[PDB]
Amino acid sequence: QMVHQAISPRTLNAWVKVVEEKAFSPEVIPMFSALSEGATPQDLNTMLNTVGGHQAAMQMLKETINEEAAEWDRVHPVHAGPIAPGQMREPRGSDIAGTTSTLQEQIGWMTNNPPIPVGEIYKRWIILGLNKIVRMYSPTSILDIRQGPKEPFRDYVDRFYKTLRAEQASQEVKNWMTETLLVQNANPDCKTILKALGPAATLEEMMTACQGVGGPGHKARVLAEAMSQVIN
């Protein structure tokens, strides 16, 4: 037969925009519940594959799906023997998840009498994964990258640029983030030097200027400055 509730182009685009705009806020759960209703496991897998970024969250979702597939296998004992020509094989957990089943098999299960709604079962598994992501997963934010009090400026710059590469933004916005947040979120010891350097300093100049922060000479210099302020 045919699946009447196969996802339309606008449904897929709406799901993509939901993920891009809201990330994994709780709002994602109702949206996925409504956009994916009636769809085959193949359509749900398409929707899950359209998620860009958030690799850790997607791995969490995959783990949850695998656990639910194991639970399905536990509850449904394997039947051994020759299947009737009219009948078809009973779904397994991987069949529900669509890893070991074709679209035709999923449609056959969904449109059979009695019907096995593999799409809805898989949808509930995905919802469990999404709930776990919403509770547990925290996406990386370039706004959260601050230099530690004893962190070398080079390591902080490396973390900043890694997070910026993972950041969802336009290249112009990422350039503006580099120009604004990197110096601002440095620790006070490095920030003093960076401000003394001037606004026109390049990254190499900034990195050389802070290369000694925490070394013997810089420690002695700041200690002597504080002691001189005290004596005066």
Ligand X SMILES: CC(C)(C#Cc1ccc(-c2ccc(Cl)c3c(NS(C)(=O)=O)nn(CC(F)(F)F)c23)c([C@H](Cc2cc(F)cc(F)c2)NC(=O)Cn2nc(C(F)(F)F)c3c2C(F)(F)[C@@H]2C[C@H]32)n1)S(C)(=O)=O
Ligand Y SMILES: O=P(O)(O)O[C@H]1[C@H](OP(=O)(O)O)[C@H](OP(=O)(O)O)[C@H](OP(=O)(O)O)[C@@H](OP(=O)(O)O)[C@H]1OP(=O)(O)O
Q: Residue 131 touches which of ligand 2I4, ligand X, a copy of itself, none (CB < 5 to 8 A by kind)? A: a copy of itself
Cα–Cα distance between 53 and 140 in angstroms, integer? Answer: 10
Site residues for ligand Y, 181-220, by CB under 6 A, read: 214, 219
Please tell me the count of residues contacting a copy of itself according to CB under 8 A: 106
Cα–Cα distance between 99 and 41 in angstroms, integer? Answer: 9
Site residues for ligand 2I4, 189-228, by CB under 6 A, read: 223, 227
Name the residue among 211, 92, 80, 88 with its Cα closest to residue 155.
211
Site residues for ligand X, 71-110, by CB under 6 A, read: 71, 74, 97-99
Binding residue for ligand 2I4 (CB under 6 A) from 10, 80, 231, 232? 231
Q: Which is nearer to ligand X, 98 or 152 (CB)?
A: 98
Per-residue interface string for the shown chain with ligand X, residues 36-75, x marking contact by CB under 6 A: ------x--xx-xx-x---x--xx-xx--xx----x--x-
Please tell me the count of residues contacting ligand X according to CB under 6 A: 24
Q: Which is nearer to ligand 2I4, 173 or 223 (CB)?
A: 223
Footprint of ligand Y on this chain (CB under 6 A)? 150, 214, 219
